Each structure stands twice: as C-alpha cells, then as structure tokens.
Structure 1
Amino acid sequence: TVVLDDVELREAQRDYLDFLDDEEDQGIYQSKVRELISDNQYRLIVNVNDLRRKNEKRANRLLNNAFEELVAFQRALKDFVASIDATYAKQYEEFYVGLEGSFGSKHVSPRTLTSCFLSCVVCVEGIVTKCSLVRPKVVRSVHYCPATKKTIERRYSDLSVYPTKDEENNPLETEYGLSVYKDHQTITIQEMPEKAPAGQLPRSVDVILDDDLVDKAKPGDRVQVVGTYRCLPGTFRTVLIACNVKQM
C-alpha cells in the first residue's frame, strides 16, 4: 500500500518549475526568489494571473483544488530554490507560496463566503475583530529510544497521541532540537460594517496563520487574505488556512 508514482503530481510539479524557471522570460519570478533568498524569508508571493497567462489550465486546476496543487507548488519552489542555492534551501525544511491577483468568483466577503467554496482558494476581504495569542504548534516530533538505541519520528500536519513509549514500552525521549515547531495564530474576520445590512446576521470566519503570517495582522485591520477554505474534523466546523495576508 505504498504509493510509487503520481504522474499528475509529477507533471504539475514540472509545470510550476517551468513557470518558476523564469530565465527565458522577463525574470520577474526568478528575481523574486533571488530577492526572497536575500530577504532570507521562505514564502514567495505569486500573482494568479501570471499563472493564468502562462497556463490557464494549471491556474484553474490550482483554484479548484487548492491543497494538492499548492503541495506540488511548494515542492517546485523548494526544488527551484535548491537549484539556485542548495544550502539556503537546506536552512528551511520547506517553503510556501503566496497567491495574489484577481479572482472572479473566489474573491468574496464573509457575508458571501458560502459553504460551496470548501477546498477552493478564496480571497476573503474583511475586518479583523478577534486575535488569539501566538502559540508554537508542533508539527513533527522526533523521539529517541535509548533501550533500542533507535530514533523514531512522527508527523501530525492535518492529523494524547504524543508518543512516549516504544512498542516494547521502552521510554522515549524527545529530541527537542530535531523536532519541528511553528508559531501559529488564529484570528476572526467579519464583513466591513459600513457595507453590511442591519437585517442579516454576522458571518464570522476563522482564519489560521502560521510562520511569517502570524503577526502580519492585528484586531481592527482591513485586510484581504488568500487561503484554502476547509472543513474541520467532526454538521462540521469550517476554517480558512491562510496562504498570504495583506493589509489594504
């Protein structure tokens, strides 16, 4: 039950890498990653219309299936950065893609954010009301087993469960250095109060921010965030995972 090859993922990653391979063309994205490398950040920004222009099919594929396409995109980005500089790529476990530009239907407001947009990219524009404290979220925890002299890993990602014993009940000690952690903040957006009817009710949407996106927002800020609108595990609760934030 081990997946061997995903030709769709293979081709989609190549298409992004070709798009990122901006040397035959004006160099706008090649310069951006070069500037990103100089910036030392790990979250490139992308205009969707460039992707539409270079490949309308791929952009439609991205917006209709945000999750998998982005994973391919982040794969291509890290590979492309490693092409330009391996060690700088080795600094960071991963890289991230920030979307930008025009979205016809997917550019909505919390009033108009329907349940239909689940799993689609959406550019929600609104006003921040509530902000949670910055907290470090654990994503990948490394453990060591002195009895077996063996190292074991676990990834959480979207998935009490913190392992502490070997199957043989050997004690496990967590390699805090090797384990992966990331700051993680939650905020809430609402419709702009000027343009909202008194008859209807509030439509509060919860946003998740990670890494550099954490404190690029405060309560009472007019912002638009592009992200992947998703359900939550269990009638269900729904939240938006930010891909890029900007204070208009």
Structure 2
Amino acid sequence: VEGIVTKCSLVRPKVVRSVHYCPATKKTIERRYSDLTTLVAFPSSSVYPTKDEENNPLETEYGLSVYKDHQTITIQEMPEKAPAGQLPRSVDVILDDDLVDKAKPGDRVQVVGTYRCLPGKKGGYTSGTFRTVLIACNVKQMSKDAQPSFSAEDIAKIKKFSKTRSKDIFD
C-alpha cells in the first residue's frame, strides 16, 4: 500500500514477557504474552499476575521483563493520486518493533504487510462488521532518491571520472 501518513500514534511499549518477584517466597515468575493482535484472545491470555498462588503480592521486575514497542499510523491515498472529486480513503497500519518510527505525518511511504481483520471485544451480540488493519512487515520511504546504492564499479567509475580531468570537470 502506498500513501501519505496522516497520523502517527506515540510509540508505546507492549509487554511480551513479564517477570515478577515474590518478596515473601523469594520466587521469580515469568509470564509470556503471545502476539494475538489479529487472533482470538481469550481473557486468560491477558491477565497480569499480581498475586502468588497463596495471595502473596508480586512485584514486577521491569528491567527483566521484555517489551516490544508498538505504533499505529494511518495511511491515506495520496492527494495527487486520489480521484480529484471525492474524499480520501485511509487504512490503519500497525507498526511493531524496528518499524515504529519509520514514518512521520506527511511522509509518503510504501507499507508492505498483511491485511487483516481485528477481533472485536467479547460480546453476546455482534454486527458482522470488522475493523481491518494492515500489519506491516516492511516500511520504506518514497525517497528512493534519499538513499543511494554504490557498487564497486560505480565507485571506480566515479574515481576515474574525477582523476581524469580534474580541471574542467565542473564545466
């Protein structure tokens, strides 16, 4: 998907592995949180441990826990490419670690990723209506003119061009 970044969220950390110390028992606990962004998530999958089995309080070890940072951006159809009459169309994009700060509002970007339905909340009734996002696997800037690619032959050609006529090269 190609478009222009209209809004970026803040970069937030999302806990993927929390480590908890029990001062009463001296025990250390680790809990894993799997990435259920577009999967079904039962509530057992999202509980944060606060008590020991016999209700001793746990203290979370922040430095030992693992977080991955998470961002959401919205990509809009580029104004120069949108049909000149009507209102713009957008898509939401989830950026996860390594990809978060790659785009800022007003940037023209390609986002490669998986287009997916997000789960709604638990409920006994549903409209059949699903909220879709693009889960990025790659983000690249339009400025393929702001990053060059020099091979050994290119460098050699440049060096010879500069050495040959180092006087009227400017002209």
TM-score in same-fold range (> 0.5): yes
Q: Which runs of 5+ in 2 are unaligned?
A: 121-128, 143-171
State which of 176, 179, 182 in structure 1 corresponds to 2:68.
Answer: 182
Please state if 1:226 is matched with 2:112: yes
Q: Which residue of 2 aligns with 1:133?
A: 10
CA distance in 1, matches of 2:134, 2:53: 37
Give the 3-state SS of the residue equivalent to 1:178 in structure 2: strand
CA distance in 1, matches of 2:98, 2:17: 18
Give the TM-score normalised by the residue count of structure 2: 0.65
Taking the TM superposition and a 5 Å limit, the aligned residue runs for 1:26-45 are none
Q: Which runs of 5+ in 1 are unaligned?
A: 1-123
Give the 3-state SS of the residue equivalent to 2:101 in structure 1: coil
Q: Specify which structure has the bigger relative contact order, considering alpha-carbon pairs within 8 angstroms and separated by 6 or more residues.
A: 2
Report how many aligned residue pairs link the two structures.
Answer: 125
Taking the TM superposition and a 5 Å limit, the aligned residue runs for 1:68-83 are none
- Higher helix share goes to which structure? 1
- Pairwise CA RMSD of aligned residues? 1.9
Q: Which has the larger radius of gyration?
A: 2
Q: Which residue of 1 aligns with 2:166?
A: none
Taking the TM superposition and a 5 Å limit, the aligned residue runs for 1:1-248 are 124-156=1-33, 157-158=35-36, 159=41, 161-198=47-84, 200-234=86-120, 235-248=129-142
Provide Cα deviations, 1:140-189, integer angstroms capped at 9, x if missing partner: 11112233332222222225832211221111111112101122221100
Percent sequence identity over matched residues? 98
CA distance in 2, matches of 1:191, 1:215: 20
Give the 3-state SS of the residue equivalent to 1:166 in structure 2: coil
